[PDB]
Paper text:
PLLs are natural lactonases endowed with promiscuous phosphotriesterase activity. The catalytic center contained two metal cations coordinated by four histidines, an aspartic acid and a carboxylated lysine residue. A structural analysis of SsoPox, a hyperthermostable counterpart of the PLL family from Sulfolobus solfataricus, has revealed that loop 7 is shorter in SsoPox than in PTEs; linking the active site to the loop 8, which forms a hydrophobic channel that accommodates AHLs aliphatic chain. Indeed, W263 is located at the start of loop 8, involved in the dimer interface of the enzyme and positions the lactone cycle of the substrate onto the bi-metallic catalytic center.
Author numbering:
A (entry chain A), B (entry chain C): 1 to 314
């Protein structure tokens, strides 16, 4: 068809339905898990992922896009297990998630070689399977657009131009990285509308957010529940304001929820302080009803959660 | 019952025999291999490692110490297959190899949590097996002693003090990282004689090398064949000079040869320029004959390749 799914036949973008554009079934550091497997519990990770996905589906979520890629512990077989246990439509991606430097493997390797990896996942399959990547994921954060970060961005541009899969980004809302990602990508020939600039919901600086959307890309209001970056109420007020200003055409909403994540920052003790209501269904419980009670009609909701993901992937 | 061996009963340090203190059966980026297995060929890797190890054994090598750890693709089960096929004494280690930052797992984790990983590997076993780590490996390079690099150094100190295993380091011979490693370690109570400061052979700066050796630590003239760092002839001249000045009892010699390595810098085309004679037996073809033809008697050879590793591991 058009959009590849984990453990399923590919579907036309018109079949994507209600979508969570940015959620993680499981995140871990590849090298740590490989070296110290005693730190991880696959049974628990699987239960958590399945339980979260099931609840998401009980609210009418049809499709989840999971931008777990190199550096976040992408595991296609785990994803496949989750799909088999839930029946969710799952879009897996390819890409590289780094903030500073690429792994030593890439020393003296070209941007083209990097893009070749993305294209391989897109055209042939991920990690030895026939499950194909439906988008490319790239990142930048506090360190900004380092040289390796830039190489990855340009490789993503090459992959998009070859295969037409969209590009999802991770960015830091406070240091211009999102705008810079969009700039490099569009200069490399990437259609602005094939890019989702991520984590813009971490700021209430609406002029910045509008600037990215106005240049043609989707804007990721995609960390609902992560109060340590920005509280739910402030995200809500920002979201509502953008909608009132007519930006529904570019808005994408999600939680960036990790059903399991191995970082020290996570960990139960900090959750009450850092992300008390963080989960894969918070927007159904809080955000969406908030918007409706403030005059946002169902047609806008559908644009955000059905139409935008549809355009993104077509 | 003193030095743990992969796939073998432990041996008394005095039985270690002729030792290559720093060689790699295989090196790769964990994240890259997990994400793009199509880039690797385990058959080739296995055959290369076996062929190299048994040629080293024909030259009388009894023990190989392999400091492949997290970040370099440590794989205890691959190491076991190689031991089974060769009968070599192989010492595996634990540790973390980074130049800048730790994997995201370590965000908000203490130096003690890191040290616990090392101790686990030393006391319990590596990657779910009963093969135990016989030393700790740490690293620093161009970027210098970063905050995360220093945490790993301090974690290694804790591991050594708890378990008594020695510490092998990776350094950049031109920026003082080696001296710093020694400083921090010793300041944390590590016996300087339980430290090997690596890659000092990369420079002909005899004074720097001597200062480290004078402070009580072993010095790694350990990249023989890697011309891109320093040609064989200049290495030999430094080595001979050092021995001439009475540093035999601090010198350790190796190739840091990677029977297979995935980095772009490696790779066929660049070999004839970067490392034409690089292999696990270059010192038997070149270095050792050069030393012996220049006044180095068999006692000094035995000291570097048998006594020093013995002391290091006891
Ligand atoms: Co992100
Ligand atoms: Co090294
Ligand atoms: Fe994410
Ligand atoms: Fe090495």
């Amino acid at each position: 068809m058009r959009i590849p799914l984990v453990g399923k036949d590919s579907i036309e973008s018109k079949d994507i339905g209600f979508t969570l554009i940015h959620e993680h079934l499981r995140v871990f550091s590849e090298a740590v898990r490989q070296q110290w497997p005693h730190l991880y519990n696959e049974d628990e990770e699987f239960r958590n992922a399945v339980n979260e996905v099931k609840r998401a589906m009980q609210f009418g979520v049809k499709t989840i896009v999971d931008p777990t890629v190199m550096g976040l512990g992408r595991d296609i077989r785990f994803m496949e297990k989750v799909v088999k246990a839930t029946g969710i439509n799952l879009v897996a991606g390819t890409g590289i998630y780094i903030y500073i430097d690429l792994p030593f493997y890439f020393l003296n390797r070209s941007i083209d070689e990097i893009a070749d990896l993305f294209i391989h996942d897109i055209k042939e399959g991920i990690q030895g399977t026939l499950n194909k990547a439906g988008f490319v994921k790239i990142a930048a954060d506090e360190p900004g657009i380092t040289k390796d970060v830039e190489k990855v961005i340009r490789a993503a541009a090459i992959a998009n131009k070859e295969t037409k899969v969209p590009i999802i980004t991770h960015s830091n809302a406070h240091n211009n990285t999102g705008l810079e990602q969009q700039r490099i990508l569009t200069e490399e020939g990437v259609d602005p509308g094939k890019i989702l600039i991520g984590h813009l919901g971490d700021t209430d600086n609406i002029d910045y957010i509008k600037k990215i959307a106005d240049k043609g890309s989707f804007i990721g209001l995609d960390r609902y529940g992560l109060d340590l970056f920005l509280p739910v109420d402030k995200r809500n007020e920002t979201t509502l304001r953008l909608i009132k200003d007519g930006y529904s055409d570019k808005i994408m909403i999600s939680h960036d929820y990790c059903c399991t994540i191995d970082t020290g920052t996570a960990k139960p003790e900090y959750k009450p302080k850092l992300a008390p209501r963080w989960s894969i269904t918070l927007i159904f419980e809080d955000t969406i009803p908030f918007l409706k009670r403030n005059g946002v009609n169902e047609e806008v909701i559908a644009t955000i959660f059905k139409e935008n993901p549809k355009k993104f992937f077509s």
